[PDB]
């Protein structure tokens, strides 16, 4: 499928959201409840 | 129901056998002893021209 | 704007009625097919043709002048004797001419619709009959002439007006 919605990607913009930060956040919520 | 070859081979066996019409086909129905039911063989109730002559 | 939420506005001033109509005839809205045509020898159907596999989904039928044209026809479509059309007696004579010409020019045929043509032409005649006894100038002859020209272009010649000019 050659359409625009499907071809274009958001990779370049990922710095706008802090993936590492949130992963560590839910690791904190991982140890808080004791998993 | 047993399929007879023509109308003449039809017959009423019971006191309770009746003649009945199934869409232009003549038949015999028995409300008691259903083994008595006889269809005069003819075209299917739903046929087209190409499909059944 | 001029149909849905402010329907009165077009009847109020005939000036902008004829303006919209004429701009609408200038771009040719009722043959969208010649928007997509690069050579008049191979006329494109881009506006008129769809397939179920989705060719021309974007360029497919767009109601474009539909509501506008039909609506501003229904402004002239009051044929009832109880009330003559309210905007037509608000029109200057040459205005009437140019709005008839507008209709005549919007259609893909290049010929106005019968009811409209009849209404306007007949409104114009009853104006002309009254005015010709009063104050009159050579200019107003020009108006009548280029009325009669339009009339012939829409293929109804007006025998009345013609025999007025001759």
């Amino acid at each position: 499928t050659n359409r625009h919605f499907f071809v274009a990607r958001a990779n370049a913009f990922f710095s706008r959201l802090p993936i590492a930060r949130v992963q560590r956040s839910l690791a904190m919520e991982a140890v808080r409840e004791g998993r | 129901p047993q399929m007879v070859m023509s109308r003449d081979e039809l017959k009423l066996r019971c006191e309770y056998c009746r003649f009945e019409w199934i869409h232009d086909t003549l038949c015999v129905r028995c409300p008691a002893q259903p083994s008595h039911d006889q269809r005069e063989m003819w075209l299917h109730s739903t046929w087209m021209w190409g499909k059944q002559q | 704007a001029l149909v849905r939420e402010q329907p009165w506005r077009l009847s109020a001033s005939p000036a902008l009625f004829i303006q919209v109509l004429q701009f609408m005839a200038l771009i040719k809205v009722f043959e969208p097919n010649k928007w997509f045509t690069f050579s008049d020898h191979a006329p494109s159907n881009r506006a008129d043709y769809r397939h179920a596999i989705g060719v021309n989904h974007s360029t497919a039928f767009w109601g474009t002048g539909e509501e506008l044209y039909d609506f501003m026809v229904e402004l002239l479509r009051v044929e009832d004797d109880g009330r003559i059309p309210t905007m037509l007696d608000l029109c200057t004579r040459e205005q009437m001419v140019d709005l008839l010409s507008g209709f005549c020019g919007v259609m893909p045929c290049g010929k106005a619709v019968g009811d409209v043509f009849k209404t306007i032409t007949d409104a114009f005649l009853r104006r002309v009959r009254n005015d010709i006894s009063g104050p009159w100038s050579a200019h107003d002859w020009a108006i009548v002439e280029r009325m009669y020209l339009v009339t012939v272009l829409c293929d109804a010649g007006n025998n009345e007006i013609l025999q007025l000019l001759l």
Partner: protein, 319 residues
């Protein structure tokens, strides 16, 4: 695999949906309509004589009816019911002009009286005529003559009296007294208490208000007028068996079946040993349902006098 055309279903599932009794996309062309009008032996008459009115019903014209009467009075086949049928056919004329159309009613009256001595039929009829002609004294006089003759006034005589009483513009309780006296007599049998029942009769009359009125069923004069019914296969029933229009020689046979004694079947009864089962009868096309109704020579008028006044339009007759 388009599913709009070849759906995913068994033919076993799908064959309930093949209509074997099809209604709307009809099987009778227009060309045939006229033909099947002749096959049944019906005749086209000039609009003066009568016509097929809006409900596709053949109705005679008044002044057509009176003439038929005037010719056939002494005929052997003419029965006492035919008289009252004619009198009924005269009512609109009677109301629109009570002076000159009442005399006809009295011709029928006296004539009937000397062919068949006196009857309920004739007295009911003329008293209803007087009820529309708005003569009350004529009605009471009539009723007295019934009782004096030994004729026991019928339930319809009391309804005639309530009608006369009403549309002659007389107060309530003259009609109420008629209804109550009629119920004491054992003519009218009412199931509800008297007041509400009487209200029902009054409401049923005011719906029915007379020919001259501003409101009523009889007050509607528009009649879709046709020389022939615009559909020949119209049903009074459920099936095509029960069809409204039937041959004149069948409509004779059933009239025979009616007037002959009841030995095989019940009558005047609600049971009907043989029940209506149109769906049980033969469903299939006969050859006349393909080639069209069989041709019978069209009904023709030999040596009809030349149509003078062929230009003039005849007036729709309620007159």
């Amino acid at each position: 695999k388009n599913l709009a055309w070849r759906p995913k279903m068994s033919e076993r599932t799908l064959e309930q949906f093949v209509p074997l009794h099809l209604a709307f996309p009809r099987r009778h062309p227009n060309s045939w309509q006229e033909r099947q009008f002749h096959l049944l032996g019906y005749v086209k008459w000039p609009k003066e004589i009568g016509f097929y009115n809006a409900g596709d019903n053949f109705e005679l014209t008044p002044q057509a009816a009176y003439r038929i009467y005037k010719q056939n009075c002494d005929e052997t086949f003419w029965t006492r019911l035919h008289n009252e049928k004619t009198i009924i056919h005269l009512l609109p004329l009677v109301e629109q002009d009570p002076g000159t159309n009442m005399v006809l009613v009295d011709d029928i009256f006296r004539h009937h009286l000397k062919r068949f001595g006196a009857d309920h039929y004739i007295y009911n009829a003329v008293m209803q005529a007087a009820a529309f002609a708005k003569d009350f004294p004529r009605c009471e006089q009539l009723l007295a003559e019934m009782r004096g003759l030994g004729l026991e006034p019928n339930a319809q005589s009391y309804v005639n009296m309530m009608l006369g009483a009403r549309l002659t513009g007389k107060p309530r309780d003259q009609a109420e007294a008629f209804f109550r006296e009629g119920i004491k007599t054992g003519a009218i049998s009412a199931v509800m208490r008297l007041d509400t029942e009487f209200q029902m009769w009054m409401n049923q009359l005011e719906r029915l208000g007379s020919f001259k009125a501003k409101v009523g069923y009889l007050s509607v004069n528009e009649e879709g007028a046709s020389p022939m019914p615009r559909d020949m296969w119209a049903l009074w029933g459920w099936h095509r068996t029960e069809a409204k229009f039937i041959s004149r020689k069948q409509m004779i046979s059933e009239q025979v079946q009616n007037r002959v004694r009841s030995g095989k079947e019940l009558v005047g009864t609600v049971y009907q040993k043989a029940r209506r089962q149109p769906w049980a009868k033969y469903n299939g096309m006969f050859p006349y349902d393909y080639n069209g109704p069989a041709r019978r020579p069209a009904a023709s008028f030999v040596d009809a006098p030349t149509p003078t006044h062929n230009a003039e339009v005849c007036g729709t007759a309620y007159a």
